[PDB]
């Protein structure tokens, strides 16, 4: 039974290295910088038609089109400027937990309790959207998927593993293993050379896409990790958990920097995101509201209220101009 | 105010809206059932009775009523993270094999199968996502149960049972033990049925339970209840 003692020794060494690396908390370093002040965002658009619970959405890179997935068995591609519906794609499996929009804008990915990542082609010559591929090979539900490009897609599953898929052949080239719990979310770095995943073991792992191995592990949360998003420059990421707190982790420092929580809020965090500057951390909650946090000061900078049910998903445009929130009440709202 | 292409895009959006409304209307009329239980409880046998890779979906129409049975046995992941997807399910069909009391689970740990079924039933029935959701409880393998009960006492599972050794009393007392797990008896019904080889009766029982659930929902909609 030397293995248990050796692992504890290694963990103690890592902890001591992290603590020695710690000299100043981010909180007082940001004490001099002034608060953003109250952030009052108005609802500019309300997107209607899903007729059921919305579980995921993703903005297009043009900051105008967005894709939304709902338990109604429908993917809807919306023009956010005019509220028009660009596309309505029926799904074989209505139990969808995630969706993604390709950076090129040619493809839409989705998946759920079918353990399959369906890739749909949006630019067919027949004028209709068809299933271009059905990636199979996960033994659990897919929780998140993100396009690296038109031919590569990274997916996370409830089988505790992530997988990089070559869409053309339909086989997973790299398998990322090391989470003991279900993996609920993943976020791609801006350069896409490495990504970060959060799981139900209350830990986040940083994966190198090429090598295929976890480089760092972050353990600050108590219950789970439901959402994860890189900080804009790619050197930090925020995590949202069931313990009713968000956390900021710095890759290079290799530890937690700051926590975002309040006593009067005790529910779970479904989604997180950053503003273009990275000064605002937007988190969706089970209490039907979105909280806008001062990422540097860790103070509630504002609130987005107007959803009658759980805020399941939220995303900021690449230009940073607007925010989109999708909720269990079957409505998407644009905030600005 | 709109350009010609903008008007055409708006017309396309309107047609998409009509299709979405038609799909939602078709879906709302259709009953959704969630099938739960252990692997050997007899999910597949009742599935084939009612008929005649992730989630398995089964369709069947009985007395002008459409049913969607969702089987989730393959999902070995944490149930807490995907159970809420079935929040608005019409009913939960929970399967348990009566002949599991003598059988112990294959795992090294020595624990009776009936107790694992009881714990799973307690977790599902008292789940916060299913508070007013009705449960159709199927007690399968009744013939094997009546053979084994004469062959073996019922005290094996839990000696607190001091009742007479008989198929009728043992079956009724197991039904009572399962129904006693319900913590909200005023707002949740549990329909118990001892499954038999006749295919017709099983579908009829589900239809009657679903009819009661639909009457309850209609009463809530009308405001009477």
């Amino acid at each position, epitope marked *: 039974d030397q293995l248990r003692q050796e692992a504890e020794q290694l963990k103690n060494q890592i902890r001591d290295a992290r603590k020695a690396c710690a000299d100043a908390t981010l909180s007082q370093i940001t004490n001099n910088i002034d608060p953003v002040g109250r952030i009052q965002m108005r609802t500019r658009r309300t997107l209607r038609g899903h007729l059921a619970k919305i579980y995921a959405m993703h903005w297009g890179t043009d900051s*105008r*089109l967005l894709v939304s997935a709902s338990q109604d068995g429908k993917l809807i591609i919306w*023009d956010s400027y*005019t509220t*028009n519906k*660009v*596309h309505a794609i029926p799904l074989r499996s209505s139990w969808v937990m995630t969706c993604a929009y390709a950076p090129s*804008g040619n493809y839409v990915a989705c998946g759920g309790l079918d353990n399959i990542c369906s890739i749909y082609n949006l*630019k067919t*010559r*027949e*004028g*209709n959207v068809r299933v271009s591929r059905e990636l199979a090979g996960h033994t659990g539900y897919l929780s998140c998927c993100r396009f690296l490009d038109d031919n590569q897609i990274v997916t996370s599953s409830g089988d505790t593993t992530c997988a990089l898929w070559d869409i053309e052949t339909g086989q997973q080239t790299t398998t990322f293993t090391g989470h003991t719990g279900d993996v609920m979310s993943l976020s791609l770095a801006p350069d896409t050379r490495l990504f970060v995943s959060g799981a139900c073991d209350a830990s986040a792992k940083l994966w190198d896409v090429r090598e295929g191995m976890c480089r760092q592990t972050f353990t600050g949360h108590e219950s789970d990790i439901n959402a994860i998003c890189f900080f804009p420059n790619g050197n930090a990421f925020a995590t949202g958990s069931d313990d009713a707190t968000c956390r900021l982790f710095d890759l290079r420092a290799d530890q937690e920097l700051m926590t975002y929580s309040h006593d009067n809020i005790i529910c779970g965090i479904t989604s997180v995101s950053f503003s273009k500057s990275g000064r605002l951390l937007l988190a969706g909650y089970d209490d039907f509201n979105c909280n806008v946090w001062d990422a540097l000061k860790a103070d509630r900078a504002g609130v987005l209220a107007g959803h009658d049910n759980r805020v399941s998903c939220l995303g900021v445009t690449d230009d940073g101009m607007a925010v989109a929130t999708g909720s269990w009440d079957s409505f998407l709202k644009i905030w600005n | 105010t709109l*350009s*010609a*292409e*903008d*008007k*055409a*895009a708006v*017309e*396309r959006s*309107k*047609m998409i809206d009509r299709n979405l409304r038609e799909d939602g209307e078709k879906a709302a009329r259709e009953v959704k059932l969630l099938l739960l239980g252990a692997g050997e409880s007899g999910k597949s046998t009742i599935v084939k009775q009612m008929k005649i890779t992730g989630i398995v979906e089964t369709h069947f129409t009985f007395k002008d009523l459409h049913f969607k049975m969702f089987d989730v046995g393959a999902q070995r992941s944490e149930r807490k993270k995907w159970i809420h997807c079935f929040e608005g399910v019409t009913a939960i069909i929970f399967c348990v094999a009566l002949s599991d009391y003598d059988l112990v689970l294959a795992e090294d740990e020595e624990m009776n199968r009936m107790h694992e079924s009881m714990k799973l039933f307690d977790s599902i029935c008292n789940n916060k996502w299913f508070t007013d959701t009705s449960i159709i409880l199927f007690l399968n393998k009744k013939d094997l149960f009546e053979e084994k009960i004469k062959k073996s006492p019922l005290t094996i599972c839990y000696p607190e049972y001091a009742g007479s050794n008989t198929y009728e009393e043992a079956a009724a007392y197991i039904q009572c033990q399962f129904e006693d797990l319900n913590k909200r008896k005023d707002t949740k019904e549990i329909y118990t049925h001892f499954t038999c080889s006749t295919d017709t009766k099983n579908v009829q029982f589900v239809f009657d339970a679903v009819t009661d659930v639909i009457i309850k929902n209609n009463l809530k909609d009308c405001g009477l209840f």
Partner: single-chain antibody
Amino acid sequence: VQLVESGGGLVQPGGSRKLSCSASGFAFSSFGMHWVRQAPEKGLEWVAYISSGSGTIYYADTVKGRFTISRDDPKNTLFLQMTSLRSEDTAMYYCVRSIYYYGSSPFDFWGQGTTLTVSADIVMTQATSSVPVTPGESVSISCRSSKSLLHSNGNTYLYWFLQRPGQSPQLLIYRMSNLASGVPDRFSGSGSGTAFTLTISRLEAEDVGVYYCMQHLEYPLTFGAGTKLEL
């Protein structure tokens, strides 16, 4: 994708006939449809438009009342009923598909066309009528509009089509800056409201033909006279 027209031939003036176009290889019911006529020795002229779902119908002023446009989705067919045919109705009729949503490319596919013989607004100006060119040099074709095509939404609704000898016209540019799918990067569209240009760098033999500019700002749907290229 395939659109095949039928129902042509000689007709007595004052009579009637029903052109039919059969669509195959694409989702016909999701496309709006257009009829475009071309007289034997002249340019293109928009005739009628029926939207997907038959919700909206438009006609050219010269055919309003006389012509009717219908579609039968189950058979994937488009129909043009024409009555009281005059001498001006002698032309090749092309059926054109067009789908309208953000980022779409209308007028992308044209049918082969059916010939009809009868024997007894925004003005778009092609300043030039013919220029001789040789492979290797850049070519510029100019178009002018009597009204600004730049809409308040940021789009300029100008379309460049190429009709090679004996073939149907094909979309080269949609909204004056977007290259149609399958068209080489040799073709480029530029300009501003009321003045537009099509540039062909590194010209090749198959580029020879007649180039047309069209406006899609409003439904008069008006074509240019046509600038021809020769060897």
